[model samples]
Target chain A: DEAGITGTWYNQLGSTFIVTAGADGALTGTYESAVGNAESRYVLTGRYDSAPATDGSGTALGWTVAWKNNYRNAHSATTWSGQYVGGAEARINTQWLLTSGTTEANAWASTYVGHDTFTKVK
Target chain B: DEAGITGTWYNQLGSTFIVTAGADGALTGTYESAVGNAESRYVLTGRYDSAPATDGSGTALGWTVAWKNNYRNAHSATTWSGQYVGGAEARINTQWLLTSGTTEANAWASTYVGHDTFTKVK
Candidate 1:
């Protein structure tokens, strides 16, 4: 009846977002980064307003991954807040916030902000 | 050479952890879960003391996944804290904490604790 954002998406940075969408509008994505120590499979959970779009655009959504330094220590993470737009071409355009925690006693050296226009690859 | 935990691991619940370890003790895992909406590719980052053992045991390590409710809100997650024992066989016995957050208003009805002895598979 509507467009689905379930499958794979890639940003300009070669980061992969393997997404699984639920009927309840739940958004589950496995984020594989192309940076950092280069970790694979970061869990991202969020919602898509639980509604479908005719053209597969304008579904407001967001998700975050709590990056860990180890088991007992969690440090920084990146959160994507934006919408999923679909059509002949589908894209997830999100502005990401890279934030660090106080577990490091001082937190991120600096809070970084960026944007990603993820194009559906597969 | 020492026993390495770089490969695949399975818990009792049919969950899979595809782990990659760095020589610096950084751990990145792709957690394919069998429960809770049955999501795949949850990212887990952690450390293992940056040291290796002959038996592959006595290496203290831990990791966690920040479970999300949607974009703006987060609910709960599980963190695994345990040591790896490698000998005739290798087992990662972890005590997990499934904790909820305040975004849900009241949070998880109860504090729950569990254990899983993950075995190396293939």
Candidate 2:
């Protein structure tokens, strides 16, 4: 319904994102201007999981999504976890955490954070 | 006019920012979600310059702003150069470069880019 998150979304920061949700509930997208301009950008690949809200409220649903931001370098890649709240199949609010690796992947113990928001465009 | 860039701005990335413009045109602000959430964040301090457009159009004006994103570590500090196009005294669009120190500033050569967009909130 409503294309189910398969479309374009623009963020408040003026960046544009084009997302595609697959039949299996996997997601792939590109955030234009996330890096620089037309030539430079970020590739995002992730999956989505749906369930009831933690408070046991049947009127609202909970959505958890995980994605990776593949920047120019592997060390710079960020893993993101986002939580969203929607009502009766309509998603509304979201909060996400972008974790940047402090050390290497194996020794990764600490991380810095980046955040984002999404509004449907198409 | 309109307080001259002294106000709050929100980015497309869901990050909230509050900026203070000094009488000397210097800019200082904080991006709430640029680094992370709540306790963890980034401090931005920079300056602004105004001039005629590079294309010599004269009808349109150009703005150049430089700022640093001070994260938890010196290595993660990002130097940003934003070029904006505005007319008279209004800033309309912007494109910025967030440069991460490649090799500790002194030996710095290459840098990974993080981009952002801004909309005046107040």
Candidate 3:
């Protein structure tokens, strides 16, 4: 069978990302932040590493979610880019970037960037 | 063989998008604006419809490019979502949304949204 990224993965401490991969490497997924912060399972779209690598799982699996939950519904979007690694327990290490939605001195100050790992669930 | 979306597509007016698909429906590509307007080929990442449908070209061919070329980079991102239709002449009808990178009353006024058609070139 061809390589693919279709499953549920979760950050041990935070969000649960569930994804359905398409035949052509297109991705549809959900990104819900830490429950304490908010309660919104955003619909996200992104792409994966199309090139087959030594690891059957592939790498560079990334997706972004627009903050449709926001008032403007388009000012903020969060992107997660990571590698799908396979092993005793498959895992994905990712870095996320949240764009700055405001305009002012040091506009990017409002921007947030972080990293985490997510283990495959199914 | 699994379905795929790997090639060059042109708007016929502005921008030439070139994409390379990964094994898992992830996508990597380029978005170059019209020559008369600018001269920069920005790298892009997006996804394609993985579920095989009636049209071999697949539908929901979407991708996003952040304006790293901009002053702050993370402030603006342009996302293009389209349906790839296979016919005597293949084509993709796309709607693009550019997020607002500013703050103020009616900040979203700076946001740009447009639509266009791109035909498969090769």
**Global fold similarity of model 2 (TM-score):** 0.34
Q: How much RMSD separates candidate 3 from the native structure? A: 14.3
Model 2, A27-99: lDDT tens digits are 6877664332123446777666534346743222123222334434434344445544344443334433333
Off by over 4 Å in 3: A1-4, A35-37, A55-58, A70-75, B1-122
**How many collisions per candidate?**
8, 5, 13
Arrange candidates by lDDT, descending. 1, 3, 2
Candidate 1 docking category?
incorrect
Q: B2-48 in candidate 3: lDDT tens per residue?
A: 23357787896767888886665466777776733234765677655
Q: DockQ winner between 1 and 3, please give it.
A: 3
Question: Per-residue lDDT of B88-118 in model 1, one digit per residue for the tens?
Answer: 6777756555444222233224224567778
lDDT of 3 by residue, A70-116 (tens): 32233344556555655567676665555423333433253455666
Candidate with better TM-score, 2 vs 3: 3
* CAPRI classification of candidate 2: incorrect
List lDDT for all candidates, in order: 0.56, 0.46, 0.56
Chain B TM-score for each model?
0.79, 0.54, 0.78
